């Protein structure tokens, strides 16, 4: 197929630089011209440049200027951007993208900070020996104390979609917590197994938790 | 440079209806803008470009518009899954900047919250935490309140709220609320509740355990 595959979320202290790569399958660079777009976390759009591949040449925005940098190379067919002297403003998501009619890429997020890797811990919620002989039932999940984004959570490896919510991190002292929930019917449960996995890809940690009714 | 400038800011309109984004240049763009609708998590979408060319794949409900420094997206007989932001983008000469989008919610019949609360994980006990959590599945309108009273007094230190998007179908929300305590603090009192407030019903829906 043809589409745009940016690099990999980042950690960075700050002071620091980081270099992202967005390359193209199944197209050729050298025949478009490329642009990147930036996004704080809960703010809107803003363009950093754009850059002709073939002769080399780029137009920033004056804001970014001497913070970005982008460079392409035909040869590997991948654009880069370069980010110098990071700071908490610029911890965002990067986009990658082509002037004309094709999807931009996935996106690389870049969370610059002196907080450590830190995995989470997921403690598993069961309800308290209430009336659950009622149509459904809702189970949960409380991921807590990871850093940085993101983790994933799924309910028994992806197949339990309908009645499933992820509600969105929120830090504390440098921490994340998140949660999910899911609304199985009272006959499944528990007569099979919910369980929920979540992976944080940061620490290379997944964790898989049973809910399973509290004891006496 | 161009200054594009976005309105409305928010807006809430309901299925079947007619909206209309405007975004207006401060300089002639000659007709070299495009309408882009980002959803939560995932890369702006194109959806016309030109000013008036609808993109491939792109539904007949989302009509394009205008000339010189106004133009305005249409959208006829709004749909459950056109909530989102919708950013005009203009690209006549550099740099290429965004409007400041719009936020469109969807206008659905109202709902009540459907509430659950769960004492602390056997596990977490023993870290010296203990999180009571509560999830107020499905409401609509999202304005929604929830008091923690611990033995029948309210408690309003270390509570952490967070609330999803509207759902795709239902158009709907959800929010779980955490009071986090430490074991100690938790080991020394029985009742915990988690009380909400919405705009269905006048008597507030409670779920308590005693533990």
């Known amino acids: 197929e043809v589409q745009l595959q940016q690099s990999g979320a980042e950690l960075v202290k700050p002071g620091a630089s980081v270099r992202l790569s967005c390359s193209a399958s199944?197209?050729?660079?050298?025949?478009?011209?490329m642009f990147w777009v930036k996004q704080r976390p809960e703010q809107g759009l803003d363009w950093i440049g754009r850059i002709n591949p073939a002769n080399g040449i780029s137009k920033y925005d004056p804001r970014f200027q001497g913070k970005a940098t982008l460079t392409a190379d035909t040869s590997s067919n991948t654009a880069y951007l370069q980010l110098d002297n990071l700071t908490s403003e610029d911890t965002a998501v990067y986009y990658c993208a082509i002037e004309k009619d094709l999807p931009w890429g996935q996106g690389t997020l870049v969370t610059v900070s002196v907080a450590k890797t830190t995995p989470p811990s997921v403690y598993p919620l069961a309800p308290g020996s209430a009336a659950q002989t009622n149509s459904m039932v809702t189970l949960g999940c409380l991921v807590k104390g990871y850093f940085p984004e993101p983790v994933t959570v799924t309910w028994n490896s992806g197949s339990l979609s309908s009645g499933v919510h992820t509600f969105p991190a929120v830090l504390q002292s440098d921490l994340y917590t998140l949660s999910s929930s899911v609304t199985v019917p009272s006959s499944t449960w528990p007569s099979e197994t919910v369980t929920c996995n979540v992976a944080h890809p940061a620490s290379s940690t997944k964790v898989d938790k049973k809910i399973v009714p509290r004891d006496c | 440079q161009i200054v594009m400038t976005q309105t409305p800011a928010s807006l809430s309109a309901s299925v079947g209806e007619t909206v209309t984004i405007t975004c207006r240049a401060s300089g002639n763009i000659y007709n070299y803008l495009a309408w882009y609708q980002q959803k939560q998590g995932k890369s702006p979408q194109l959806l016309v470009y030109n000013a008036k060319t609808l993109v491939d794949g792109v539904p007949l409900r989302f009509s394009g518009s205008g000339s010189g420094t106004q133009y305005s997206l249409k959208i006829n007989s709004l749909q459950p899954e056109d909530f989102g932001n919708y950013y005009c983008?203009?690209?006549?000469?550099?740099?290429?900047?965004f409007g400041g989008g719009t936020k469109l919610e969807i206008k659905r019949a109202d709902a009540a919250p459907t509430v659950s609360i769960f004492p602390p994980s056997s596990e977490q006990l023993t870290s010296g935490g203990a999180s009571v959590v509560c999830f107020l599945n499905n409401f609509y309108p999202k304005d929604i309140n929830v008091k923690w009273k611990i033995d029948g007094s309210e408690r309003q230190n270390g509570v952490l709220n967070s609330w999803t998007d509207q759902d795709s179908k239902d158009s709907t929300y959800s929010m779980s609320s955490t009071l986090t305590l430490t074991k100690d603090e938790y080991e020394r009192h029985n009742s915990y509740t988690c009380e909400a407030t919405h705009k269905t019903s006048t008597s507030p829906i409670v779920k308590s355990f005693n533990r």
């Open positions: 983008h203009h690209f006549w000469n550099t740099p290429y900047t």
């Open positions: 199944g197209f050729n660079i050298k025949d478009t011209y």
